[PDB]
Subunit: 206 residues, 3 copies
């Protein structure tokens, strides 16, 4: 499947707090993001996730990252979570999430793990961590995966290096600490988001 | 096991058509190749594979690449396929192929995946994609795998870099787009095959 | 869990013989090592392992490397082995060893394999082979693994590069051929061990 949002960039907001969630999510969205996730190792995700679903779920794909256990999927479903991101391939996590009609983008590092993820019904794939591997690793995989699989680079993706993940055939990227680190200002988030979006538009044109 | 052909180089002919199969396979064989495979993402492999078995199966190991499903092994067996190559480790694919008396060289990326492949009875191993990993990755694995396992580099292997995969302890390599890209001339195939064979003979001597 | 020895460096003595075991183990210990293992591809490990348990097991963590099969764990338990090191993730090997009250540090290469190892009850993790991956790979993993997991670099770790594995967040490293190659002198072992310990003390201070 191709990606089902206007812009194939996932904003990852690791360690954000409930009191600052609405302002930082507003900042990425104002810049043209329409896919956002909050990792479950963030404090009080059980407050900020459903808060953000209600505030921004009509105009963006909202979800969760670092999802490791099936029962976490269950709780997130009741919250209105629409997107599941993961560091690893766990078949039952993927199966349960797909069952709720959620978009799942699970993390793998090898060809074996990637084909496993697809059999579980993953609609997209996350290659993690992408930096250590480089773009040529991704291009080598794409040549053997089904032609229409949406593939995301995650791990040290910058506005400066984004274009080479695009050239390698990625549908997009998930953006972590180069977009958001815990305790940075709203202005920093709005500055970084604009720069990523600008770099993407340039890369796609080329 | 050691490799059971005179020359441990696998010609990979991705995207070849039935009308050009005999000429390009003849070209690699004339150059001294005796192991060839046609990936199942090639158009009309069900015509070119059994055609090539009948024409060249007496003087070369003939097989299939990109084999992902047990039932594909079944169909290939009736065709006279002798060799199975894969991007990933799938235990039942390996088991069924070994059961037909086929030579199997399945693709892995880690130590865990490699030991899994051997328990399924793989007689050789493909490390894929090799370029991103480099020769030192391969040498590190060899130091822990059983001493007589035949190990093949696949992924961006060139006549220029071949020697360093040999120095790292590989029995050989599978050769993709640097040997054959779809729609290249027969002359190009004969030129590239000669260059790989020449580079191998130099590397083994050293 | 944090590491349960004074110094988080594992001496790996691949291919050592029973006649030289006591002298080379004494040399690493005299230098401040208190964790040692002998790989099962070493000749007559069934003599040198229990010999070393009796001589040095009161003042060091003593164990085995290259452990691939559950039944090997059983035999090692009767010998008094306290530590299990591996190249791969095998759930039942880890489970059986943990069951004997042994410290297990199994080898993985991906996030998927690492989470698998933890569910089997591994108290530490070995990232192998670390050199090809580099420190940034390790740091990327640490950011997603539970904060208190003890992580060891194994594969081409030198006194010169040790500090960058420390900076990346490793609890320590397992030291192979740069500490011991088969047939080197006792003096060489004592020289290399001192250099690793010195480099560790410098890295931790920084």
């Amino acid at each position: 499947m191709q990606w089902q949002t206007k812009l194939p960039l996932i904003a990852i907001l690791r360690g954000i707090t409930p009191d600052e969630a609405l302002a930082h999510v507003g900042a990425v969205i104002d810049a043209g993001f329409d896919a956002v996730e909050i990792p479950l190792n963030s404090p009080q995700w059980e407050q900020s996730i459903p808060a953000i679903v209600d505030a921004y779920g009509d105009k963006a794909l909202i979800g969760a990252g670092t999802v490791l256990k099936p029962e976490q999927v269950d709780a997130l479903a009741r919250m209105g979570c629409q997107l599941i991101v993961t560091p690893n391939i766990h078949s039952e996590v993927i199966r349960r999430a797909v069952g709720y009609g959620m978009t799942v983008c699970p993390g793998c590092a090898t060809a074996t793990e990637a084909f496993t993820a697809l059999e579980a019904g993953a609609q997209a794939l996350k290659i993690f961590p992408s930096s250590a591997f480089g773009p040529q690793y991704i291009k080598a995989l794409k040549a053997v995966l089904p032609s229409d699989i949406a593939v995301f680079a995650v791990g040290g993706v910058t506005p400066e290096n984004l274009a080479q993940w695009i050239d390698a055939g990625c549908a997009g990227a998930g953006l972590g600490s180069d977009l958001y680190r815990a305790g940075q200002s709203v202005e920093r988030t709005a500055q970084q988001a604009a720069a990523f979006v600008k770099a993407y538009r340039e890369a796609v044109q080329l």
